[PDB]
Amino acid sequence: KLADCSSKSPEECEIFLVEGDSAGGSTKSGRDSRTQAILPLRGKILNVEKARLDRILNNNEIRQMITAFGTGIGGDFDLAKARYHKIVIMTDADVDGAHIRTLLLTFFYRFMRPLIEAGYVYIAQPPTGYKGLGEMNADQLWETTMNPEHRALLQVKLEDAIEADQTFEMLMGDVVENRRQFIEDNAVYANNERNITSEMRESFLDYAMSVIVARALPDVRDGLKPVHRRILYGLNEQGMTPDKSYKKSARIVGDVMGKYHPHGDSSIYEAMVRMAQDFSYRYPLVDGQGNFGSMDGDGAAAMRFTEARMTKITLELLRDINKDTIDFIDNYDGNEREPSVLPARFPNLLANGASGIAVGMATNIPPHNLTELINGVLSLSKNPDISIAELMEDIEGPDFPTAGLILGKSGIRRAYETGRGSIQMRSRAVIEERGGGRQRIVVTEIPFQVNKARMIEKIAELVRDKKIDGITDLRDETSLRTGVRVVIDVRKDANASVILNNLYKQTPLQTSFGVNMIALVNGRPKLINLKEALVHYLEHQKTVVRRRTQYNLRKAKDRAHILEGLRIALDHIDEIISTIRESDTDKVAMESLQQRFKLSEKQAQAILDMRLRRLTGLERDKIEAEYNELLNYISELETILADEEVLLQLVRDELTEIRDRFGDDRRTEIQLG
Amino acid sequence: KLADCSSKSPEECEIFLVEGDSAGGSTKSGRDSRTQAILPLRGKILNVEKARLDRILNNNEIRQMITAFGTGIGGDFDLAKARYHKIVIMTDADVDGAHIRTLLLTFFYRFMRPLIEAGYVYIAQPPTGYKGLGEMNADQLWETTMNPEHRALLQVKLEDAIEADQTFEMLMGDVVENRRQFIEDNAVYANLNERNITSEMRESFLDYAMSVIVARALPDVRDGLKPVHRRILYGLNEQGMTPDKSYKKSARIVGDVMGKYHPHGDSSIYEAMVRMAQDFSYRYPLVDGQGNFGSMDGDGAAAMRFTEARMTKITLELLRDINKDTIDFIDNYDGNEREPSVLPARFPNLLANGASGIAVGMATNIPPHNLTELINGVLSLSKNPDISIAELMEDIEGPDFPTAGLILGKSGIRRAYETGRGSIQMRSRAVIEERGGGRQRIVVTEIPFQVNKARMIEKIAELVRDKKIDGITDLRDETSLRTGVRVVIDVRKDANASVILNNLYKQTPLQTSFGVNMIALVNGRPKLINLKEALVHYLEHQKTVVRRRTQYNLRKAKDRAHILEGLRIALDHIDEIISTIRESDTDKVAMESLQQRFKLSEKQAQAILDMRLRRLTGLERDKIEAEYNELLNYISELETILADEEVLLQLVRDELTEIRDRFGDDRRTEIQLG
DNA sequence: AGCCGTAGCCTACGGCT
DNA sequence: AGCCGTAGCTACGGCT
Ligand SMILES: NC[C@H](NC(=O)c1cc(-c2c[nH]c3ncccc23)cs1)c1ccccc1
Ligand SMILES: NC[C@H](NC(=O)c1cc(-c2c[nH]c3ncccc23)cs1)c1ccccc1
Ligand SMILES: NC[C@H](NC(=O)c1cc(-c2c[nH]c3ncccc23)cs1)c1ccccc1
Ligand SMILES: [Cl-]
Ligand SMILES: [Mn+2]
Ligand SMILES: [Mn+2]
């Protein structure tokens, strides 16, 4: 992939390590090809601080870089053999580019340290902002970043080797907790010559913070990561409600990528596909048409071949969003507005769960039954001091979209009391007696997130390697009519219970869910227990409904004000018309109407905008009937805002309506205790 | 790769040859894995009627099929070794799926003919319509196409061997002209269980061939556009992507075009849009691109998620008056949208930007031209219907390439213009300089149209290496944005630089030919046309566009004047109007009362009822009367255009001259007299 | 020793000094 | 000849 330069005098030659194939092709066209070489890197590269020597040496990009430099590595490093005297790290001016920078410096420090000590390693300075290298043309990349006459390069400098050793070990090594403490202790600070320790700390902090608060962890209030929230908001802004026709996924994803989510379309589309899978989401948020994948790990077809829209339950996540219930923010480029959180009129975080690998931490929250969840929220609203054990009278435990069994309540109880616990998920399997003493095992439900075809291959593997005994045949007979159905035939000699018990132990036929409930609370990650998760969601609903009521109250008062001016005008229309006719301009008519009938500017404006058809008999009555209905509505809104109990009951009534409309039976059976 | 079935009893097993990877994955999931195997095909496959034996045997997809079947080929072929007793052709029910069917049947008939005679070859019958296989889920493909219990299969049968041999030879072989004659003869019959193989070949290839001719590879004579380019520019217009507005991500532009009008791969759409934004490809660029949009060295544009685009100003003239009932709209591919059959094209875009296209039975190759020269030619033609091509060449000297360069003589230009066909020699602009003290060098500043600069330089270097050219010391590409193209060729002292340059013309793309072959769609049919005929169809298109625009504006102006007459009556008797309205209980009563008391039409009584009170102020009253008086002169002016053909023709002349004055530019390519 | 989920071509077709 | 232009691997954490 290396596009070398024509010169062979290393002293004047420079190689640019460029993030991205798009930027790789543009820099190859914009470079001074006499003295500048380009090695494009696909994206994220191996972290050699966590990797074994065999994987480092056999890694393709590591090998391309060694071969391009010519120095060798480690002990065999020969600085005199360097083919370039400037090695220039050139990544996007964003958090992922900063991550690629920390990964490249980790490789140079552990395997080519004299390269750094000699001053040969540099960091390019492309234009900052939201536009990445791949979006610039070849002349721009030359004039701003590669041209020696104009560019600014940072020369990486090693000042303290002991401090650098500890910095690379802490940021890039296997001990997660020291890395997490560094992130937590510097979060407020997040997002020529360059000290390598300062570059590592500052670039890794920016990346790790952005992954934590703007990528991999869901918000406690609506249960969504930014990519999902932007998909669902984009469906709402595009009018993609369940009553409208399906829309091509490429159009949906392209709009979301351009307006809110400036990342690879595959990240957006695969997150949309998951929201449409009934084996992944307990309450699917997207309604898909076409091939959207399978339990067997099949991917969806390419997004130009599929279509989608919202499900009906997603309408409840977006409900009241245009009633100043949630704060909007500027998008990535300042050209759009996007919601910081969705109103989320059902507890989505616990309902559909969440899995996300961040930096310094990860999250793993199982899905739940929505009837149970809303019951728990209702019980909580009536008892702020409710205990977790009493909440478990409503919320028995997780409810997976793929059904199955859970073994005992001890794991469930641990997870709910502390945020962490190991939950054993077992497939639903029965042993059928057959003629001739024969037996067969029939599996109709498998654990959550288990790839069925893969599970079946594991069993086949054990049978092929003689690791298990007595299996005569293994068939996947799953169908649309029957659902999951995996059949295992047993030898007459064999005992089916022994085989089945061994299958739970050696295959994904039984798998554990490691609960680790971490979500963003007030924008920051916290490990939360079940009651904490329900309290933050209930507080979210009280704030949404309160803000909606205040919005509706503003709007009703403004309309009542307008109708008051309209009534006056209609009651004295001849006077009104004559005032307007004797006015030469709109401004004079406005002033004459306000001065004579003691109307407001808003009232006078509405009168001038009133059409002649409003002068008919039924119209006067229509205006009066709307006015009286508005007065009753204003009084009702004020009653809600005046009594916290009235507001809380409104929240209860609306949660109960959602429970009745969307609540469904528990699928996963919780065995024993 | 092949996804085999579990059973090894051939007579119960079936293999499906599935079009596309997406459909291949979903058929693998929806099939009966016991007895059904899937072999997905990337897309179009080798035509074995045109390929020699070493290319066929070396083809990966041919090999996979041969290995999957187990029969061999020949000759060395054995039916008893067949691994499936059903080989099912499963392609989209569209023209490209029909093409893949003809390609697969050609491989079976030429290399596995006893497979057909044995009855083992079948054609799947997926749901017809616009949705393809790749758009269906796994259960739909099973229930409609693969389930033995509910599916319909066509068993391919070979009735007459001689007829079949001739059919395969004509449709799929190398003699283009007999294939073209077949298309022309049966064109009327295009795109409107045992299945005869000859009938299947003739019907499926006709459908494909006709579609490529009339709705893919050839431009319309009136606006100079292929379907993909017309839908790109129409989409930019519907998305409001005018030059005044901000750039928009290309992935959004392409996604909308693909979902609304062009149900094909996004790469076809994007790459076509990219070409319209390159000033080395389009003499008058139709797209304004931001980001990396390629280079003369064959570099591709950046991926469409990284680039942005909008219209250029001149593209506004292709779309001007499109919403004035100047052109016919048609239903899109799925009936959910409307799209233009042709753009108004207020400048002659076919000849201005040219066209290149490879269809079936024919191809086209039309070079770009200077817009000032073209419009003067159309103006000359509008004043003299009997003007000759030689006289039109007094306006239109010849092609004008965006890459400038030289054309050697007028003899190929004149043949092309008189007949539609002719060879034109394009030569780079090169000068010989002195670089001290006795040394010389060749500096190339312009290269021929459609020539890859890097590829050309590599060719020269190839000659130097290989000692095919004796006198070159150095070869450098000093092209820059400021400099423009600049390729430097250093010559050895005392070596003749004139001799090396002349040899470089003869041995490299430094001199290259443009084979003119002016085929465009005229009345929906492909036609070889000379220069005058191309200009004649364009002028008739413009007369029709301006006439239809004038008719539309007149009806709109009469409607508006009619409404203004009602408002003026309401203003003259406003007291009566108000009283009449107040007196009425409902709007319907007010409507009826206004009509029967003031002799107003229903439309006028509605416009009065919709009149806002602010229209009653003094300035607003005068505005109604001032609009009406201006409208009456406008109506008179429009009726003069429609009453006299000469008046209409002069308006066409005036508006074409305004586009010439606004957009016309200097000739770039020098036509050297030789 | 891997798994979860957001991130960073070949070919048809015609013509041609 | 071969070309033109519209088509059909890794990071990260935590379990095991
Ligand atoms: N117990 C809390 C602890 N939090 C953290 O590790 C981190 C907090 C932040 C953070 C983001 N924005 C901020 N703004 C101001 C201050 C801090 C932050 C980044 S990491 C934890 C969470 C999850 C698991 C264990 C421990
Ligand atoms: N809408 C009920 C109505 N009164 C009014 O609306 C108002 C009118 C005026 C007013 C100020 N100067 C005038 N000069 C001419 C005309 C009106 C006015 C201010 S309020 C009414 C009034 C009396 C009886 C029934 C209903
Ligand atoms: N007549 C010249 C000849 N035409 C053709 O080869 C073809 C015409 C058509 C066709 C499309 N739509 C139709 N509708 C009715 C009848 C025929 C058609 C397909 S091929 C030619 C053109 C260009 C070059 C050589 C020969
Ligand atoms: Cl009158
Ligand atoms: Mn980036
Ligand atoms: Mn298709």
Left if phi > 0, otherwise alpha if psi is -120 to 50, otherwise beta: which for A546? alpha
**B contacts of A254 (beta carbons < 8 Å):** 249, 251-252, 254-256
Contact A257 B246 (CB under 8 A): no
| Resolution in angstrom units | 2.0
Contact B25 A138 (CB under 8 A): no
> Which of A612, A614, A620, A622 to probe the B interface (max B CBs under 10 A)?
A612
Token duo for residue B40: 């997905």
Between CA B367 and C1' D3 the distance (Å) reads 17
Element (H, E) at A136: none
Phi/psi of residue B518, nearest 5 degrees: -90, 85
Cα–Cα distance measured from residue B647 to residue B235, given in angstroms and rounded to the nearest whole number? 34
Stated length of chain A: 673
Domain A1-187: give its CATH code. 3.40.50.670
Ligand 6 ion local residues (Cβ < 5 A): B 92, 94, 132
Which of B310, B329, B326 lies closest to B232 in space, CA to CA?
A: B310
SS3 of residue A175 by DSSP:
coil
Which residues have C-beta within 8 Å of that of residue B378, sequence separation ≥ 6? B348, B535, B538, B539, B656
> Which of B617, B623, B624 to probe the A interface (max A CBs under 10 A)?
B617
Phi/psi of residue A613, nearest 5 degrees: -65, -20
Give percent helix, percent strand, percent coil of chain B, each to the nearest 5.
Answer: 50, 15, 35
Cα torsion angle, A134, A135, A140, A144, sign: negative
Which residues have C-beta within 8 Å of that of residue B294, sequence separation ≥ 6? B274, B278, B300, B301
Give chain B's largest Cα–Cα span: 107
Q: Tell me which amino acid residue A136 is.
A: M
Cα–Cα distance measured from residue A581 to residue B438, given in angstroms and rounded to the nearest whole number? 93
| Cα–Cα separations (whole angstroms), residue A62 to A87, A112, A122 | 14, 12, 18
Cα–Cα distance measured from residue B69 to residue A50, given in angstroms and rounded to the nearest whole number? 48
SS3 of residue B647 by DSSP:
helix
d(CA A322, ligand 3 centre) in Å:
58
Q: Tell me which amino acid residue B198 is.
A: T
| Cα–Cα separations (whole angstroms), residue B584 to A596, A618, B183 | 28, 9, 69
Q: Taking the CB of residue A415, how many other CB atoms lie within 10 A of it?
A: 25
Closest protein CA to C1' of nucleotide D14, residue: A362
Which residues have C-beta within 8 Å of that of residue B111, sequence separation ≥ 6? B48, B56, B73, B74, B77
Residue with tokens 């004079």: A588
Token duo for residue B47: 């035509």
Give alpha helix (H) positions in B383-435.
389-392, 411-419
Q: Tell me which amino acid residue A315 is.
A: L
Cα–Cα distance measured from residue B67 to residue B472, given in angstroms and rounded to the nearest whole number? 52
SS3 of residue B308 by DSSP:
strand
Radius of gyration, CA atoms only, chain A: 32
Cα–Cα distance measured from residue A364 to residue A367, given in angstroms and rounded to the nearest whole number? 10
Between CA B19 and C1' D1 the distance (Å) reads 32
DSSP B448-487: -TT--HHHHHHHHHHHHHTTSS--EEEEEE--BTTTBS-E
Structure determination method: X-ray
Contact A588 B617 (CB under 8 A): yes
Token duo for residue A586: 């709109």
Torsion of CA A260, A266, A272, A274, to 10 degrees: -140
Cis peptide before B75 (omega within 30 of 0): yes
Looking at the CA of B214, name the nearest ligand. 3
Contact B609 A610 (CB under 8 A): no
Left if phi > 0, otherwise alpha if psi is -120 to 50, otherwise beta: which for B191? left
Cα torsion angle, A388, A389, A393, A395, sign: positive
**A contacts of B92 (beta carbons < 8 Å):** none
Which of A42, A36, A61 lies closest to A141 in space, CA to CA?
A: A36
Which of B293, B32, B325, B327 lies closest to B151 in space, CA to CA?
A: B32
Residue with tokens 């070493």: B54
Q: Taking the CB of residue B565, how many other CB atoms lie within 10 A of it?
A: 16
DSSP annotation of A311 reads: -
Torsion of CA B314, B316, B318, B324, to 10 degrees: -160
Token duo for residue A129: 């902002």
Cα–Cα distance measured from residue B140 to residue B23, given in angstroms and rounded to the nearest whole number? 11
Chain B CA closest to residue A33: B477
**A contacts of B139 (beta carbons < 8 Å):** 480
CA distance A581 to chain B (A): 5
Phi/psi of residue B224, nearest 5 degrees: 75, 20
CA B95 to chain centre: 16
Which of B515, B514, B532 lies closest to B390 in space, CA to CA?
A: B532
Atom of ligand 3 nearest to the CA of B214: 11
Residue with tokens 């999931």: B29
Contact A22 B303 (CB under 8 A): yes
- Is B442 in contact with B500 (CB distance < 8 Å)? yes
| Cα–Cα separations (whole angstroms), residue A330 to A327, A334, A523 | 10, 5, 16
Instruction: Name beta bridge partners: A87.
Output: A15, A121
Cα–Cα distance measured from residue A372 to residue B586, given in angstroms and rounded to the nearest whole number? 53
Looking at the CA of A571, name the nearest ligand. 2
Token duo for residue A387: 């205990």
CA distance A396 to chain B (A): 35
Whether the CB of A525 sits within 6 Å of ligand 1 = yes
Q: Taking the CB of residue B308, how many other CB atoms lie within 10 A of it?
A: 21
**A contacts of B616 (beta carbons < 8 Å):** 577, 580-581
Between CA B289 and C1' C8 the distance (Å) reads 25
Atom of ligand 1 nearest to the CA of A525: 22
Atom of ligand 3 nearest to the CA of B181: 6
- Is A394 in contact with A414 (CB distance < 8 Å)? no
Cα–Cα distance measured from residue B142 to residue B32, given in angstroms and rounded to the nearest whole number? 8
Looking at the CA of B518, name the nearest ligand. 3
Strand D nucleotides within a 7 Å radius of protein CB atoms? 3-16
Indicate yes or no: strand C within 7 A of the C-beta of B55.
yes
DSSP B359-387: -SS-EEEE--B-HHHHHHHHHHHHT-TT-
Cα–Cα distance measured from residue B179 to residue A230, given in angstroms and rounded to the nearest whole number? 53
Least CB-CB distance to B292: which of A26, A254, A291? Answer: A26
Cα–Cα distance measured from residue B302 to residue B280, given in angstroms and rounded to the nearest whole number? 17
> Which of B143, B269, B305, B586 to probe the A interface (max A CBs under 10 A)?
B305
Q: Taking the CB of residue A148, how many other CB atoms lie within 10 A of it?
A: 11
- Where does ligand 2 bind, in terms of residues with CB under 6 Å? A 567-568, 571-572, 575, 596-598
Token duo for residue A649: 């009951």
**B contacts of A307 (beta carbons < 8 Å):** 135
Domain boundaries, chain A: 1-187, 216-673
Least CB-CB distance to A304: which of B137, B258, B584? Answer: B258
- Is A421 in contact with A414 (CB distance < 8 Å)? yes
Specify burial of residue B531 (Cβ count, 10 A radius: 0-12, 13-18, 19+): buried
SS3 string of B585-600?
A: CCHHHHHHHHHHHHCC
DSSP A361-407: -EEEE--B-HHHHHHHHHHHHT-TT--HHHHTTT--SB--TT--EEE
